Amino acid sequence: EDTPQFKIDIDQEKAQALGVSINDINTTLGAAWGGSYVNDFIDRGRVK
Amino acid sequence: LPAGATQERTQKVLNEVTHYYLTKEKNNVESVFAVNGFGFAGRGQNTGIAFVSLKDWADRPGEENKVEAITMRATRAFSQIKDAMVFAFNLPAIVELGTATGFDFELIDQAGLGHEKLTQARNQLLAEAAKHPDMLTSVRPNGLEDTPQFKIDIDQEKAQALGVSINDINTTLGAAWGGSYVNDFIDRGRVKKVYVMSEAKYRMLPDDIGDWYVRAADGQMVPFSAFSSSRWEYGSPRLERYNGLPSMEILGQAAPGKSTGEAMELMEQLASKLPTGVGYDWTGMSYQERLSGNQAPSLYAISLIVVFLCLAALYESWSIPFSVMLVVPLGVIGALLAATFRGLTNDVYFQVGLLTTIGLSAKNAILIVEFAKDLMDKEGKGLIEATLDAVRMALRPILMTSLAFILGVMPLVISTGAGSGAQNAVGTGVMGGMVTATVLAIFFVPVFFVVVRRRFS
Amino acid sequence: SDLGKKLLEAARAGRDDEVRILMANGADVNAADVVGWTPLHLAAYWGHLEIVEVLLKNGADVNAYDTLGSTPLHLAAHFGHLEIVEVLLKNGADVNAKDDNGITPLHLAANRGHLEIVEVLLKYGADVNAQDKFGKTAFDISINNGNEDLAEILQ
Amino acid sequence: TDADIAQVQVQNKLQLAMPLLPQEVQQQGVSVEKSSSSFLMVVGVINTDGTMTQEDISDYVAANMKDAISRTSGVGDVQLFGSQYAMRIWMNPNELNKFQLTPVDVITAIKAQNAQVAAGQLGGTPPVKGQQLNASIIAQTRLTSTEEFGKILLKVNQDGSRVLLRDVAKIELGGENYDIIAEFNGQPASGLGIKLATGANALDTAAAIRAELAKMEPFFPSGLKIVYPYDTTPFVKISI
Amino acid sequence: PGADAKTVQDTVTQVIEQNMNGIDNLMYMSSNSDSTGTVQITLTFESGTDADIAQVQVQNKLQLAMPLLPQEVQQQGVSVEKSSSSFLMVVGVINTDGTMTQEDISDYVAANMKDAISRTSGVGDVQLFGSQYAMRIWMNPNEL
Amino acid sequence: STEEFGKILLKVNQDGSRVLLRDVAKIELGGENYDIIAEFNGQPASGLGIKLATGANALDTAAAIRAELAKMEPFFPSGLKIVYPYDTTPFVKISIHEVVKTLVEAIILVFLVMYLFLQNFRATLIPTIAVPVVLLGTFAVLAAFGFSINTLTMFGMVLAIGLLVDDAIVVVENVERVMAEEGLPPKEATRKSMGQIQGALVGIAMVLSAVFVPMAFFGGSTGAIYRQFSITIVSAMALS
Amino acid sequence: PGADAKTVQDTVTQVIEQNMNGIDNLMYMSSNSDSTGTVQITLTFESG
Numbered sequence A: 001e002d003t004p005q006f007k008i009d010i011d012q013e014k015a016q017a018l019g020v021s022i023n024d025i026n027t028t029l030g031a032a033w034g035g036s037y038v039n040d041f042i043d044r045g046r047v048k
Numbered sequence B: 001l002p003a004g005a006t007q008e009r010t011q012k013v014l015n016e017v018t019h020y021y022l023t024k025e026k027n028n029v030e031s032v033f034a035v036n037g038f039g040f041a042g043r044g045q046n047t048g049i050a051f052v053s054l055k056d057w058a059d060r061p062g063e064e065n066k067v068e069a070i071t072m073r074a075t076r077a078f079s080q081i082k083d084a085m086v087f088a089f090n091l092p093a094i095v096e097l098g099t100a101t102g103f104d105f106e107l108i109d110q111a112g113l114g115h116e117k118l119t120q121a122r123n124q125l126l127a128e129a130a131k132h133p134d135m136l137t138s139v140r141p142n143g144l145e146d147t148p149q150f151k152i153d154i155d156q157e158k159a160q161a162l163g164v165s166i167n168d169i170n171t172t173l174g175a176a177w178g179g180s181y182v183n184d185f186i187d188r189g190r191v192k193k194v195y196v197m198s199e200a201k202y203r204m205l206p207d208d209i210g211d212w213y214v215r216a217a218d219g220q221m222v223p224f225s226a227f228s229s230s231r232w233e234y235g236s237p238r239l240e241r242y243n244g245l246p247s248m249e250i251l252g253q254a255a256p257g258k259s260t261g262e263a264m265e266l267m268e269q270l271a272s273k274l275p276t277g278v279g280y281d282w283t284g285m286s287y288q289e290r291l292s293g294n295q296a297p298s299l300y301a302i303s304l305i306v307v308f309l310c311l312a313a314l315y316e317s318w319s320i321p322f323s324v325m326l327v328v329p330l331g332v333i334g335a336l337l338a339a340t341f342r343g344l345t346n347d348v349y350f351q352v353g354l355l356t357t358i359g360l361s362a363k364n365a366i367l368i369v370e371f372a373k374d375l376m377d378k379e380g381k382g383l384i385e386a387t388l389d390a391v392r393m394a395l396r397p398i399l400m401t402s403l404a405f406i407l408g409v410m411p412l413v414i415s416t417g418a419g420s421g422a423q424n425a426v427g428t429g430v431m432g433g434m435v436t437a438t439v440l441a442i443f444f445v446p447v448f449f450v451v452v453r454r455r456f457s
Numbered sequence C: 001s002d003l004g005k006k007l008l009e010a011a012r013a014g015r016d017d018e019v020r021i022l023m024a025n026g027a028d029v030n031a032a033d034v035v036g037w038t039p040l041h042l043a044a045y046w047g048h049l050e051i052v053e054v055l056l057k058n059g060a061d062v063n064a065y066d067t068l069g070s071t072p073l074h075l076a077a078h079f080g081h082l083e084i085v086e087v088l089l090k091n092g093a094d095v096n097a098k099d100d101n102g103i104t105p106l107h108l109a110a111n112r113g114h115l116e117i118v119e120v121l122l123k124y125g126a127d128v129n130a131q132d133k134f135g136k137t138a139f140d141i142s143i144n145n146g147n148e149d150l151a152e153i154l155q
Numbered sequence D: 001t002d003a004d005i006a007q008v009q010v011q012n013k014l015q016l017a018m019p020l021l022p023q024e025v026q027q028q029g030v031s032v033e034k035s036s037s038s039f040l041m042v043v044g045v046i047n048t049d050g051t052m053t054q055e056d057i058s059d060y061v062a063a064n065m066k067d068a069i070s071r072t073s074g075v076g077d078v079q080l081f082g083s084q085y086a087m088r089i090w091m092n093p094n095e096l097n098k099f100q101l102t103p104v105d106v107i108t109a110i111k112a113q114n115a116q117v118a119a120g121q122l123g124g125t126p127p128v129k130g131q132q133l134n135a136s137i138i139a140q141t142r143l144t145s146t147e148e149f150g151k152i153l154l155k156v157n158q159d160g161s162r163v164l165l166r167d168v169a170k171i172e173l174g175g176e177n178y179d180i181i182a183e184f185n186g187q188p189a190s191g192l193g194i195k196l197a198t199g200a201n202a203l204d205t206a207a208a209i210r211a212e213l214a215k216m217e218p219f220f221p222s223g224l225k226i227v228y229p230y231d232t233t234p235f236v237k238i239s240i
Numbered sequence E: 001p002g003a004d005a006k007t008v009q010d011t012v013t014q015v016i017e018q019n020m021n022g023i024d025n026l027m028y029m030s031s032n033s034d035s036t037g038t039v040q041i042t043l044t045f046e047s048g049t050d051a052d053i054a055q056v057q058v059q060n061k062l063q064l065a066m067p068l069l070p071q072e073v074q075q076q077g078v079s080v081e082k083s084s085s086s087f088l089m090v091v092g093v094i095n096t097d098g099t100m101t102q103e104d105i106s107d108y109v110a111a112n113m114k115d116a117i118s119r120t121s122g123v124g125d126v127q128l129f130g131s132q133y134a135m136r137i138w139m140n141p142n143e144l
Numbered sequence F: 001s002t003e004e005f006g007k008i009l010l011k012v013n014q015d016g017s018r019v020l021l022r023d024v025a026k027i028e029l030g031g032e033n034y035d036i037i038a039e040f041n042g043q044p045a046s047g048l049g050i051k052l053a054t055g056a057n058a059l060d061t062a063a064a065i066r067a068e069l070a071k072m073e074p075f076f077p078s079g080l081k082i083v084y085p086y087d088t089t090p091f092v093k094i095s096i097h098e099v100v101k102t103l104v105e106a107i108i109l110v111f112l113v114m115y116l117f118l119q120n121f122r123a124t125l126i127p128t129i130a131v132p133v134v135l136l137g138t139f140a141v142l143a144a145f146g147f148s149i150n151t152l153t154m155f156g157m158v159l160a161i162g163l164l165v166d167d168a169i170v171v172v173e174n175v176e177r178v179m180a181e182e183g184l185p186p187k188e189a190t191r192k193s194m195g196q197i198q199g200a201l202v203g204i205a206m207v208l209s210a211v212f213v214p215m216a217f218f219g220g221s222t223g224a225i226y227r228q229f230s231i232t233i234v235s236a237m238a239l240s
Numbered sequence G: 001p002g003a004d005a006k007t008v009q010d011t012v013t014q015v016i017e018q019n020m021n022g023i024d025n026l027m028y029m030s031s032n033s034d035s036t037g038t039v040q041i042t043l044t045f046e047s048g
């Protein structure tokens, strides 16, 4: 069934007015609240 | 050549190898294909192969002008060469299949021990294997040893302080010293690559590192030495993996007299005494042998059972079939005598030769027993009477087939030309096998039948 | 020389028996590969204590430096070979030896966090205020790596 | 229908769509499987000594067992009942704002300072005449520990003080995801949910799985033990 | 290009190896990563396995793993070949009057010979021992 | 062209002077890599590694390759020459030739031996017909099962000659004896002669099948080699 | 996209065609390269 979801509207005019890029906003929101797979590292000889 | 040996040094050795083959083996060698920078066991500037092409077999009479002779002479000649491991060797019969002599062992890191600890565990196994010359011979790593490498640390703080980006630093280093595939261009209507790289003389020695400048945000050119430090360390020039885990391939073979199966069982015993988290497995020829060896007993059993069942139906008795099956050794002894004398091996060609030798000897006996039995059943003749009448009738056609077939394989035995190694393995085992099978069976087959008939009824 | 190159491989491999025979036959102890590593450099790196002692007994240069100015004490201290660090220092290894980068055995020992070796080096008079080409001390490395135990020692 | 050809045809068309998919989706790895919808068996893994948590067991299974089982013939799909470890950078927004930094700066710094760089060689080909030295140049390598990720330099302030990644985030080894948590009789556990490849024999595949599990057991850490909490194949063998 | 054994292993070889799943009749997998910047992963299959089905199943799993590899490795690309095969003959191409380098000869063979030999009746595969020309920009750091 | 790459603009200075790529780099057409240096008798060398196509004829393919290289001869730059350091066709040429030789010499030997004992040309002609018929038939069975003319299958027929030659001699020799001992005409002699051996010949066929057929059921590389000799010898024997 | 027939033939069609050797039961191969940057290489195989 449908569930409550938190709808957030980015104001393009305000973002442009304050000199805040939409790429930085979307990454900041997405990385923090969603998680971001940046790159790989080696944990005891295995790529992870 | 030894660790860190350059292309120019490897070339000078290949030049000596090429010079030898076109000087000392002028009568035998047609060409030398010198490939500097490639080896089957690992690549690099310190490795290379010289593919020697000989003249026609007809222009190389006698064993003195054959590959095995030239190989021995070449290997001895190149023994004197300093700071280089140089030796000649023949190609495997089937190049598709590989060497296929000895065993193929994989030492596996099963618990993330790392390269250094797997090396120590490998050295331990090789050392323990070297204590058993009577069972194991030439137990060695297939891969390459660790070599000195130039570890350069980029100081992040100094780079950020001077306003030099890391991408610019790592691009400048990689592109100049390593080379960089930028994009494609079209040369006379064909797409080809564009490579940017340092001119040789500016990417040779560590002092050249400091001659490379990167532009900072403020537009100042900063030398590489300003934000970098360097030290020597050791690392692998060739890392191996088996079934997704770090591994090291070890080649070896059974000592003279000992079988490969025995040599494998010792390697397994030695492997079980290695440090915690170090496993092993068998690959290639070894993997193939273990599964093939497990099939052999059941296939020999099925073969003997059906042979007996067919003969039992033919003669309508459980006992008489034994009189035919007792010929097997009469042919096999002759093949082995001929093989042992001429100095050949128990090879595929010899093994198929035994079966055809066994086959025709069995056929000779089958007809003697059939005629002997028929004379006893129908005409009501006695055991000895029927046997004497059978061998009398069977003498001529056995001698005709034997004489014809022995003369027929004579060219294969004495052949020394192209594909003679195969012809020898075919003819030798068959000729010797036929001689004893012919001479013995005519006297022993009647003994088998008479003795079997006496024992059972 | 031939024996000189056999000693380098023997010292690296840790073949105590082969080193003995080479010392008797007089294999060059100052023999160096293209990177400038002596048998003592190699023995110190791979952690072969008994061979380090045998080479020093046969007049090996304890303060030998490679083409980047690094010594056996640098290698021993960096890869956590406590007993080899002690033997080298006892035979007069320069405790304040600087490579071309201005890096000392103490810097390297501190970076890998070898607490025992840091105290052995400091006991033999390691300069705790010694700076590399970037102006960093053993203390600067300890607080950057976040090694509190090591940071406590260097005061 | 031949499952091999079906898979080939399905993937041929997927490869036309792949470039149009978001970069984040491509980098998670898109998979094409031919298997039953139901599980052939569940291979359970527990620690009887209680020396390893559900998270520890899940990582070990993912890192030392899953891949070999996934490569076994007849194994169509393998579901890890748990997650493999990832380097988790748990960001703090208060600390990020304090040093005038964002998740964009953190991602840029990690890509820059957790890098495997191809630096070339000393005396590399084509070389100059009379070169004696040939050696690989080693620059930055992948970071291996929480400590190394911790001392990643984000910025240097005007006074000269250093802002490290550990100053704006907590750093630990933790699952790629924290969605799947398994138990065996109320006890911390991981496991592999194995699905039978289309047309493959259930009993032969089960035997091949047990043979591959047998090669792993000897090299287990103390306490770790394979359990068999769900298998459909014993019924097939016994019923016959 | 310009990568060490460890760089190749930890960015290419390990990533490909982890994605070699769901492939039928695989006996064992072996690989080596060397300091020339090269990786070779050989997958050996059961005797009687269709080599075409084996190859395409490997190719298909590689394709989906390509976005996980470095940008420089995606540029060069990753070849999937039947390696179990052997050579019928080796045609050598040489220069006797010393006017052409191995690079000059390799380019001529690539441009004017290889394709025609590939189209010849009964020819299954043709491999150039060398490479076609590349636009080489040999940089000078003093001038830069 | 290298000329165009030379003219690539990098920088325009304040005074107005232009910095091109040729000012900061040497530009030429070279190799993709310089790791390998190939020489043929000291002279610079390249080459082509040619593999045989599935179900193709090696001797026809090599001839076609040499014919195609001959058409390229006129367009070669001055100094360029073709050489054949490795070529496997001489083997197969001699392998087939030496096989044809052995089977011809075998028929010639049978003729002499048949005449030496039986002393009539009519008797010597029956094996001279029978042996070729069986050999040709063996190739048809070889083709049917998807086998090729190769070293193993070729020596497989040579190893079977004894069994083929024997069937021919046994049948004819036994008829000649029956006539010599009983005085029956050829037709009545053959009816009785075949009546004595027909049961055994079928028995022999079943026995020899049991010896060679199981050899074909070995697995891996060894099994593949054995299967070449097994199917060739059993087929030749079965037709005989 | 955007490439002429000559450009796409040299960079795509010939690159693919020169690798279409040693395929079983190949009767003939026909291809066209057009001004929309489109390449189509059709391989026709023996009956059966």
Ligand SMILES: CCCCCCCCCCCCO[C@@H]1O[C@H](CO)[C@@H](O[C@H]2O[C@H](CO)[C@@H](O)[C@H](O)[C@H]2O)[C@H](O)[C@H]1O
Pocket: F057, F059, F060, F063, F096, F097, F100, F103, F104, F107, F131, F132, F135, F136, F149
């Ligand atoms: C005892 C006689 C009994 C009769 C039955 C025996 C038949 C002969 C046995 C060998 C069968 C194969 O025979 C072999 O066929 C291939 C074609 O596939 C030929 O192959 C080659 O022939 C000639 C030889 O100069 C080449 O120029 C040509 O390029 C190529 O076709 C071999 O020359 C031929 O010897």
Ligand SMILES: CCCCCCCCCCCCO[C@@H]1O[C@H](CO)[C@@H](O[C@H]2O[C@H](CO)[C@@H](O)[C@H](O)[C@H]2O)[C@H](O)[C@H]1O
Pocket: B294, B295, B297, B298, B299, B302, B306, F206, F209, F210, F213, F214, F217
């Ligand atoms: C003219 C008629 C000719 C008859 C031809 C009959 C066809 C030949 C059938 C071959 C089938 C293979 O035969 C099968 O091989 C497997 C191995 O792979 C054997 O399996 C074997 O495994 C273990 C291995 O340790 C042995 O110790 C054991 O003796 C045996 O069971 C089977 O017991 C056998 O039944």
